[PDB]
Amino acid sequence: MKQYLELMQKVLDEGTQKNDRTGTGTLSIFGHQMRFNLQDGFPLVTTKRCHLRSIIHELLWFLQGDTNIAYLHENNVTIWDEWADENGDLGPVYGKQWRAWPTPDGRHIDQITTVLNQLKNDPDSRRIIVSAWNVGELDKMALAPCHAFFQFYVADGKLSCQLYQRSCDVFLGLPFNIASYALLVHMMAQQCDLEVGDFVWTGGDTHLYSNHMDQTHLQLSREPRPLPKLIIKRKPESIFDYRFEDFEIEGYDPHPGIKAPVAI
Amino acid sequence: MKQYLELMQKVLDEGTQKNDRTGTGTLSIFGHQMRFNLQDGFPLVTTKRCHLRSIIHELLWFLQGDTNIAYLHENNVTIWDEWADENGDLGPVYGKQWRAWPTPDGRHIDQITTVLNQLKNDPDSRRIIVSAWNVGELDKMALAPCHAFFQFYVADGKLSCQLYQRSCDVFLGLPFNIASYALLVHMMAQQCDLEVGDFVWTGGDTHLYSNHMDQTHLQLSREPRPLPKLIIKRKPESIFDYRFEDFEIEGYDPHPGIKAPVAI
Numbered sequence: 371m372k373q374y375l376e377l378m379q380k381v382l383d384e385g386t387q388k389n390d391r392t393g394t395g396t397l398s399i400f401g402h403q404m405r406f407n408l409q410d411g412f413p414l415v416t417t418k419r420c421h422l423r424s425i426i427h428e429l430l431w432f433l434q435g436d437t438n439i440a441y442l443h444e445n446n447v448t449i450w451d452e453w454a455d456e457n458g459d460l461g462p463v464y465g466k467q468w469r470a471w472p473t474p475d476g477r478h479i480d481q482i483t484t485v486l487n488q489l490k491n492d493p494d495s496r497r498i499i500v501s502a503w504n505v506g507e508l509d510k511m512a513l514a515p516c517h518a519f520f521q522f523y524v525a526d527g528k529l530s531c532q533l534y535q536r537s538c539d540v541f542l543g544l545p546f547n548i549a550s551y552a553l554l555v556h557m558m559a560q561q562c563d564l565e566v567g568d569f570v571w572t573g574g575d576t577h578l579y580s581n582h583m584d585q586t587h588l589q590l591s592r593e594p595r596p597l598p599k600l601i602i603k604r605k606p607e608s609i610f611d612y613r614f615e616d617f618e619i620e621g622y623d624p625h626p627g628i629k630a631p632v633a634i
Numbered sequence: 635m636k637q638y639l640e641l642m643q644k645v646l647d648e649g650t651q652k653n654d655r656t657g658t659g660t661l662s663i664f665g666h667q668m669r670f671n672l673q674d675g676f677p678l679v680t681t682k683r684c685h686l687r688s689i690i691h692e693l694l695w696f697l698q699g700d701t702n703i704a705y706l707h708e709n710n711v712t713i714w715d716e717w718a719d720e721n722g723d724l725g726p727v728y729g730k731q732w733r734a735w736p737t738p739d740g741r742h743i744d745q746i747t748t749v750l751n752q753l754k755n756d757p758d759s760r761r762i763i764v765s766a767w768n769v770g771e772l773d774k775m776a777l778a779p780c781h782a783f784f785q786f787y788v789a790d791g792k793l794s795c796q797l798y799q800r801s802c803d804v805f806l807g808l809p810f811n812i813a814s815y816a817l818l819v820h821m822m823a824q825q826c827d828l829e830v831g832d833f834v835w836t837g838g839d840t841h842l843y844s845n846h847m848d849q850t851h852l853q854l855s856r857e858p859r860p861l862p863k864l865i866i867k868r869k870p871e872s873i874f875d876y877r878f879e880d881f882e883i884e885g886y887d888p889h890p891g892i893k894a895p896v897a898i
C-alpha cells in the first residue's frame with residue numbers, strides 16, 4: 371500500500387545507520403505516523419503476499435490471555451518459535467498484560483473487558499486504553515513489547531484506534547502489525563455496534579535491516595493493488611469467542627510472497 | 635509557534651463535537667504528530683505569553699518523585715490545586731511512576747535513572763522508555779496521566795524524544811507540555827554529553843474546549859515571533875540536582891497573554 375511504501379522509501383532516503391543488539395545493522399528513523407481509513411478497505415499489503423492465518427491466530431491467542439506457543443503450534447503458526455523457553459513459554463507478554471495486568475496487591479486488571487465496557491457505557495472517554503508496557507514485568511519477558519500501547523476513540527458512531535509501536539521492522543513485522551490491529555478494530559466495532567473509523571499507526575525507532583535491502587528494492591518497484599474487504603461471517607456472543615473460521619478477505623490479489631531472513 | 639497554530643486550525647477545520655467528563659463540550663480530532671527541532675530554538679509559544687516559572691517547577695517536582703503540592707505552593711505554583719485533596723495530595727501520578735513504579739514483587743523501578751544508564755551505556759537501544767501509565771494504580775490517581783508514555787532516541791550525537799499524549803487540551807495544556815518535555819530533553823542531553831535533536835509530539839484525543847473558541851481565533855490571528863533560547867548556567871552532578879536558577883530564557887518577546895477557564 372502507498373502509505374507503507376512511502377515509509378520504506380523514507381527509511382532508505384533518510385535513515386541513519388545503527389548497530390543493533392543482533393549485530394545485523396539497521397537503517398533507522400525515529401517518529402513516524404500513518405493513517406488508514408478502514409472504510410476504504412482492509413489494510414493488508416498487496417505488494418507482497420501476506421499470510422493472514424498467522425496474523426489472526428496470534429491475535430486470538432492474545433485475547434485469550436495466553437503466553438505459551440502451544441495454541442499457535444496446534445494451528446501450524448511458527449512466528450514465536452525462537453523466543454519460547456523449553457516449555458513453550460514467553461513470560462508475561464501481550465496476552466497476560468491485556469487480560470490480567472497484575473497489581474502489587476494480588477489482584478488482576480482485565481484491560482480488554484474494561485475497554486469493551488468503556489466503549490459501551492462511556493464512548494466519549496479519552497482513557498480507552500490498553501498497555502502492554504508493564505515496567506514491573508519487562509525483566510520476566512522473552513522480548514519487550516514492540517506494539518506497546520494503544521488507544522480507542524469514538525466520534526460519529528465510528529471506532530478509531532491508534533497504536534504506539536516503539537520498535538518496528540518495516541519489511542517483516544510492520545505488515546503483520548497493521549493487519550492485526552485493523553482486525554481488532556473490526557472485532558471491537560462489531561461487538562460494540564459501531565462503524566469502523568481510522569487505524570492510526572505511530573512509530574518510535576522505525577527501521578529496515580541491512581540484509582533486507584534487496585527485498586525492499588524488489589517490493590518498492592511493485593504497484594499497489596486495491597485493498598481487500600474483511601467479512602466477519604458470524605457475530606460471536608463476546609470478543610473472546612471468535613474462531614479462525616469467522617474471517618474472510620474478498621478481493622485480495624497480491625504480488626508474489628518475497629522471502630526474507632529473520633533477525634534474532 | 636507555526637506547528638502549534640497549524641494544529642489549532644486543524645482541530646477547527648476537521649474536529650468533531652464531543653461531549654466530555656467535565657460536561658463543557660470539545661472540538662476534537664484523533665491522532666496527530668509534530669516535530670520540534672530543538673537546535674532551532676526553545677519551543678515556548680510566542681503568540682500568547684506563557685508562564686515559565688510553573689513549567690520549570692513542575693518538571694523539577696516530577697523529577698524528585700513528589701506527588702504532593704506543598705513544594706509547588708512554596709514556589710507560588712497553583713496549577714495543580716483543583717485536583718489535590720485536603721492534604722495537598724494527588725495520588726501516585728507522574729513523579730511517583732517516574733521514580734518508583736511498583737512491581738508485583740516488592741520492588742520499585744526508577745525509570746529516570748534507568749533511562750540515563752541506557753543513554754550512557756546503550757544509546758542505540760530501542761527500549762529507552764518511561765511510562766506513567768500504570769494500569770494497576772490509575773484508580774488511586776487524582777487524574778489519569780495525560781502525557782503518558784515517552785521514548786528517547788540517539789542518532790548523530792543528538793538526543794531526541796517522542797511523547798505520546800493521550801488527551802490534550804490544545805489551548806491551555808499543550809503550550810505547557812511541549813516546553814516541559816523540551817526542557818527535560820536539554821537536561822538529559824547535558825547530563826549525557828549529547829547535543830539536542832528533535833522533540834516529537836504525538837497526540838491521541840487532541841481537543842479544543844467550547845469555551846476556548848474566541849481565545850483560539852484571537853491567538854490564531856497573530857504572527858509567531860522569534861523563538862527563545864535556553865541557557866543552562868551549570869552542569870549539576872545528576873539530573874536530580876537542577877535548580878530553577880540554573881535556567882535562563884533569552885529572547886522571549888511574546889504577544890499579550892490570553893486568559894481562559896480550566897475545565898473541571
Ligand SMILES: C#CCN(Cc1ccc2[nH]c(N)nc(=O)c2c1)c1ccc(C(=O)N[C@@H](CCC(=O)O)C(=O)O)cc1
Pocket residue numbers: 420421424449450539542543544546547627628629630632633634
Ligand atoms: C510483528 C509480528 C509478529 N512476529 C513476531 C516478531 C518477532 C521478532 C521479530 N524479529 C525481527 N527481526 N523482525 C520481526 O518483524 C519480528 C517479528 C512475526 C514473526 C515472524 C514473521 C515473519 O518472519 N514473517 C514471514 C513468514 C510468516 C508466515 O509464514 O506467515 C513473512 O514472510 O511474512 C512475522 C511476524
Ligand SMILES: C#CCN(Cc1ccc2[nH]c(N)nc(=O)c2c1)c1ccc(C(=O)N[C@@H](CCC(=O)O)C(=O)O)cc1
Pocket residue numbers: 683684685686688713714803806807808809810811896897898
Ligand atoms: C499541562 C499541564 C499542567 N497543568 C495541569 C492540568 C490539569 C488539568 C487540566 N484541565 C484542563 N481542562 N486543561 C488543562 O490543560 C489541564 C492541565 C496545567 C494547569 C493549569 C494551567 C493554566 O491554567 N495555565 C496558566 C495560564 C497561562 C499559561 O499558559 O502560561 C496559569 O494560569 O497558570 C496550565 C497547565
Ligand SMILES: O=c1ccn([C@H]2C[C@H](O)[C@@H](CO)O2)c(=O)[nH]1
Pocket residue numbers: 513516517537538539540542543544547
Ligand atoms: O510485533 C512486532 C515484534 C517485533 N518487531 C521487530 C522489532 C525489532 O526489529 C525486532 C525485535 O523486537 O522485531 C516488530 O516490528 N513487530
Ligand SMILES: O=c1ccn([C@H]2C[C@H](O)[C@@H](CO)O2)c(=O)[nH]1
Pocket residue numbers: 777780781801802803804806807808811
Ligand atoms: O499534562 C496535561 C494534563 C491535562 N491536560 C488536559 C487534558 C484534558 O483536557 C484535561 C484533564 O486531563 O486537561 C493536558 O492537556 N495536559
